[PDB]
Amino acid sequence: ETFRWLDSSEHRRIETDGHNDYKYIIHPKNRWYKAWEMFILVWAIYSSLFTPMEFGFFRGLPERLFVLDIVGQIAFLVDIVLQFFVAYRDTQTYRTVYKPTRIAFRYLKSHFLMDFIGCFPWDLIYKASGKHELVRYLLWIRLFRVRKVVEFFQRLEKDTRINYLFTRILKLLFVEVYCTHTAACIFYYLATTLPPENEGYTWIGSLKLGDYSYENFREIDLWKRYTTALYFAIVTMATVGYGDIHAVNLREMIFVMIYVSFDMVLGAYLIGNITALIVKGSNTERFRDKMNDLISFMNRKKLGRDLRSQITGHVRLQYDSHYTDTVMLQDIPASIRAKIAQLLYLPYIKKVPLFKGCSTEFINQIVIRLHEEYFLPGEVITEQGNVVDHLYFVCEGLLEALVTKTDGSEESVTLLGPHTSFGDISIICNISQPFTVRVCELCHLLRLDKQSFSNILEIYFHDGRTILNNIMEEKESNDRIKKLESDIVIHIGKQEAELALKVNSAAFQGDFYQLKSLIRSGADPNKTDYDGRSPLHLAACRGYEDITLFLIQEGVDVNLKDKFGHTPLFEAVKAGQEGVIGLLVKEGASFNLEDSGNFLCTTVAKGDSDFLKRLLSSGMNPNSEDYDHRTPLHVAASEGLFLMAKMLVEAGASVISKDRWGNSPLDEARLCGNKKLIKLLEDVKNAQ
């Protein structure tokens, strides 16, 4: 869809069209060609100012000024053939065309014939062809050399160093003059169009200024006639109009009626462009607008006389110096603002002594969430005895940490220069701010919030431990005030003591994404502290999964005996459950449990056919016994209990096995009737 936007994308394709072939076609940014563009601009300015002066004030040029306009035509005849070898920075397909058939074309159907007619000698042709008046009107073709001046004001309007509404004013002020030069030349020419005997019916032949009479006006010096005509044209253009010089003919009345009608529109356009420049306000009135919007809300909220002088100081600081333009920056998205922040703040954050060699992603997460702030001298930022809500890094300036003993004894603890941080020994700790950080010189602090430097400090636990090691590998803070806190927060175990607990709570709640974000960054253990549990002992069974993917990941060790003697098969089968005990047994789960016979006798005694069939179905041999070496059939034949020893004996258990009293389950079952389990034991007994 880049064919739709060829301007927003594909801006500078440079590679495959610089030196295709022909080795001659100059790119229109060459330093040897832009030294010719100014030369032809000076020649075009001269040749457009002299052309109405050649038309109006002469009838054929004299014998002097002949080599001058000969070389003036030569310096443009060079530029005529030089534009066949200049490229074609294009409009729609944004690439400089080098093809010298699209250079000969796009020029021959453009400003060539108006620029080739204007290099014929029109005052040798005039003096050769019988001195005809209408062949001297072809000098006016040479006013097409104001293209080189209007192209200069188009290469200046797209120059961002100068405001475009100021280049429009300069363009209108170059249109205002040279329309008074040309009007002066035409106003003198309309006096030369009458014969010298009718010179008393002209604007200049009938002129008398002071004691000087302008009679026989073709014999006055050229710079008196030109200054007289230009004085008329400029006091007419400015609409002063003294009337010492005025139109007398009808051909001068018509020209003045055209010329003041042009200058009225031109002066109204100049006033409009100047007003449009001024309504785009300056720095001082954009300061004073929000300053009077902030004096109110400081007069009706009744803020104190010191907080008012701090607010006015910061408003006068964001204007008049230090143009912090984040309010313009907020249109830029978060990725490009993060790239700007990694360009601007990484030279300052990487030299902070708190971050002695952390990971680059952690410093990236720091510099993503930074803010620039400026404070005047005398400000208090964090005072002693309050909670720390922001972490500050001094980019440049000079700060001062102080402390008081009893009576306001403000002694200089340290002087926080550039590449220093304060508020760092209380976000790590949970204590008050220990120092009144006061400002000495105009500073440029970088502010990080407390909650950001808890989230990115608990996520990046290796770098957090590195930060705590940077804090303790010091003089143990006796450089400041010897406020030693234990050894900070000491090594607090986030390797195994809390991270195994964190991944186990992630398995218990059933969060698969938190589980795999923890274990895919390494650190998958098989043990919890404070117990013998595992991320298989929790999730898999007791929780019974939440999330079916909790068993496939990494193949963790099954049959791990915990602190209470429970394998994860036993935890999966106690809560009953029927997916993990169907799924764990193919992974090699086992029912290892000490005194399993006594446990089976207690589950006979309570009475739970579902629990005991899940024990036997998931793998259990009911010939293991207790302290009196009694099989579960020996207790399932004690209190009657049919249908409980049936599911035992279909799972496989012999009848002939004695006890402390020397009784088998045969005659132990001979306390109840014939159907009551004695037929069952005898026909599973004599079946082999």
* Interaction between residue 92 and a copy of itself (CB under 8 A): no
By beta-carbon distance, which residue lies closest to K ion?
241
642 binds, among a copy of itself, K ion, none (CB under 5 to 8 A by kind): a copy of itself
Helix (H, G, I), strand (E, B) or coil at 587: helix
Instruction: In whole angstroms, give the CA distance from residue 534 to residue 561.
Output: 10
**379-382 CB contacts, 8 Å cutoff, 24+ apart:** 379/310, 379/438, 379/439, 380/436, 380/437, 380/438, 380/439, 381/437, 381/438, 381/439, 381/445, 382/422, 382/423, 382/433, 382/435, 382/436, 382/437
> Is 423 annotated as contributing to ligand binding?
yes
Nearer to K ion, 241 or 377 (CB): 241
Instruction: In whole angstroms, give the CA distance from residue 171 to residue 154.
Output: 10
Q: How far is CA 222 from CA 229, 237, 401, in A?
A: 11, 22, 79
Closest approach of Cβ 241 to K ion, in Å?
5
Nearer to a copy of itself, 192 or 236 (CB): 236
**What contacts 42, CB < 8 A, 6 or more positions away?**
none
Based on its alpha-carbon atoms, the radius of gyration of the chain, rounded to whole angstroms, reads 49
* Interaction between residue 28 and K ion (CB under 5 A): no
* Interaction between residue 592 and a copy of itself (CB under 8 A): no
Instruction: In whole angstroms, give the CA distance from residue 120 to residue 231.
Output: 32
* Interaction between residue 619 and K ion (CB under 5 A): no
Residue ranges of the alpha helices (H) in 153-212?
Answer: 164-176, 181-192
Pairing mode, strands 411-414 and 398-403: antiparallel
Closest approach of Cβ 241 to a copy of itself, in Å?
8
525 binds, among K ion, a copy of itself, none (CB under 5 to 8 A by kind): none
* Interaction between residue 241 and K ion (CB under 5 A): yes
Nearer to a copy of itself, 4 or 405 (CB): 4
* Interaction between residue 242 and a copy of itself (CB under 8 A): yes
Closest approach of Cβ 35 to K ion, in Å?
43
* Interaction between residue 210 and a copy of itself (CB under 8 A): no
* Piece of the chain touching a copy of itself by CB under 8 A; list 120-128, 371-379, 389-397, 637-645: 637-645
> Is 86 annotated as contributing to ligand binding?
no
> Is 550 annotated as contributing to ligand binding?
no
Nearer to a copy of itself, 580 or 641 (CB): 641
Closest approach of Cβ 242 to K ion, in Å?
9
> Is 208 annotated as contributing to ligand binding?
no
Closest approach of Cβ 203 to a copy of itself, in Å?
17
Closest approach of Cβ 636 to a copy of itself, in Å?
12
Nearer to a copy of itself, 415 or 671 (CB): 671
Whether the Cβ atoms of residue 119 and residue 80 lie closer than 8 Å to each other: yes
* Interaction between residue 674 and a copy of itself (CB under 8 A): yes
* Interaction between residue 173 and a copy of itself (CB under 8 A): no
494 binds, among K ion, a copy of itself, none (CB under 5 to 8 A by kind): none
Question: Number of C-alpha atoms within 13 angstroms, CB side, residue 206?
Answer: 14
**CB-based burial label for 617 (10 Å; 0-12, 13-18, 19+):** middle
**Total residues at the site for a copy of itself (CB under 8 A)?**
21
- Which helix (H) or strand (E) segment holds residue 72: the answer is helix 66-82
**Total residues at the site for K ion (CB under 5 A)?**
1
676 binds, among K ion, a copy of itself, none (CB under 5 to 8 A by kind): a copy of itself
Instruction: In whole angstroms, give the CA distance from residue 398 to residue 417.
Output: 5
* Interaction between residue 676 and a copy of itself (CB under 8 A): yes
> Is 643 annotated as contributing to ligand binding?
no
Nearer to K ion, 244 or 650 (CB): 244
CA dihedral 411, 415, 416, 422 (to 10 degrees): -20
**472-508 burial, b if ≥16 CB within 10 A, otherwise e?**
eeeeebeebeeeebeebeeeeebeeeebbbebbebbb
Read off the tokens for 223. Answer: 């710079």
Pairing mode, strands 411-414 and 208-209: unpaired
* Piece of the chain touching a copy of itself by CB under 8 A; list 192-200, 238-246, 319-327, 355-363: 238-246
* Interaction between residue 671 and a copy of itself (CB under 8 A): yes
Nearer to a copy of itself, 399 or 677 (CB): 677
Name the residue type at position 628: D
673 binds, among a copy of itself, K ion, none (CB under 5 to 8 A by kind): a copy of itself
Closest approach of Cβ 268 to K ion, in Å?
9
* Interaction between residue 335 and a copy of itself (CB under 8 A): no
> Is 236 annotated as contributing to ligand binding?
no
Read off the tokens for 333. Answer: 């998205």
* Interaction between residue 670 and a copy of itself (CB under 8 A): yes
Closest approach of Cβ 235 to K ion, in Å?
9
* Interaction between residue 281 and a copy of itself (CB under 8 A): no
Nearer to K ion, 237 or 457 (CB): 237
Closest approach of Cβ 240 to K ion, in Å?
5
Instruction: In whole angstroms, give the CA distance from residue 74 to residue 82.
Output: 12
Give the residues across from 401 on adjacent strands. 414, 437
* Interaction between residue 361 and a copy of itself (CB under 8 A): no
> Is 168 annotated as contributing to ligand binding?
no
3-state secondary structure 471-505: HHCCCCCCCCCCCCCECECCCCCCCCCCHHHHHHH
DSSP-derived letter for residue 599 is H
**Which of residues 607, 652, 658, 660 is near a copy of itself by CB under 8 A?**
607
Question: Number of C-alpha atoms within 13 angstroms, CB side, residue 400?
Answer: 15
Q: Give the contact letters, 291-320, x = binds to a copy of itself (CB under 8 A), - = no.
A: ---------x--------------------
Nearer to a copy of itself, 12 or 301 (CB): 301
Instruction: In whole angstroms, give the CA distance from residue 412 to residue 403.
Output: 8
The footprint of K ion (CB under 5 A) covers 241
Residues placed in the known binding site for a nucleoside 3',5'-cyclic phosphate: 354-476
The footprint of a copy of itself (CB under 8 A) covers 4, 239, 241-243, 275, 300, 607, 609, 639-643, 670-676
